[PDB]
């Protein structure tokens, strides 16, 4: 079983010409402010795609993680208005900063670096427009 190698999903939809989308005042905050201020953290770098479970020889994290997510496939599907809300959008966070402590132990880097991220977007987001 030598050519069964790892692989990994195919990622994230950023677009669906069926799904309905919408332009809010909250979403346009999201992009412009909430992503595009984590994007330049120090910490962002394991959040800006998806996880590459063969580059980075982790074979168990699609086996475990069942609902993928990153700030990659988040910022394509803002910029493209893949969204009907913000709470679409949040969502979508949430199940990033989840997934890596799912995956994770408490204390491991990434689990730090995920903390570090998760509570300055809810910092960002306690004020959203409207
Ligand atoms: O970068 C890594 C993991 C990122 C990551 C991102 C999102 C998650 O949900 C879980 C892990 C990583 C993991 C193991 C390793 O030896 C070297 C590495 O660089
Ligand atoms: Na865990
Ligand atoms: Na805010």
């Not at 982790?58 to 809300?85: A, C, Q, S, V």
């Not at 679409?88 to 880097?109: A, H, L, R, S, V």
Request: with cysteine; hydrophobic share 35%.
């Amino acid at each position: 079983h030598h050519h069964h190698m790892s692989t990994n999903p195919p990622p994230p939809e950023t677009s669906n010409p069926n799904k309905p989308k919408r332009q809010t005042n909250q979403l346009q905050y999201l992009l412009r402010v909430v992503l595009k201020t984590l994007w330049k953290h120090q910490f962002a770098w394991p959040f800006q795609q998806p996880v590459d479970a063969v580059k980075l020889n982790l074979p168990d994290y699609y086996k475990i993680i069942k609902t993928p997510m990153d700030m990659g496939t988040i910022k394509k599907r803002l910029e493209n208005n893949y969204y009907w809300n913000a709470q679409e959008c949040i969502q979508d966070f949430n199940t990033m900063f989840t997934n890596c402590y799912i995956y994770n132990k408490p204390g491991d880097d990434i689990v730090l670096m995920a903390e570090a991220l998760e509570k300055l977007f809810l910092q960002k987001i306690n004020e959203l427009p409207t």
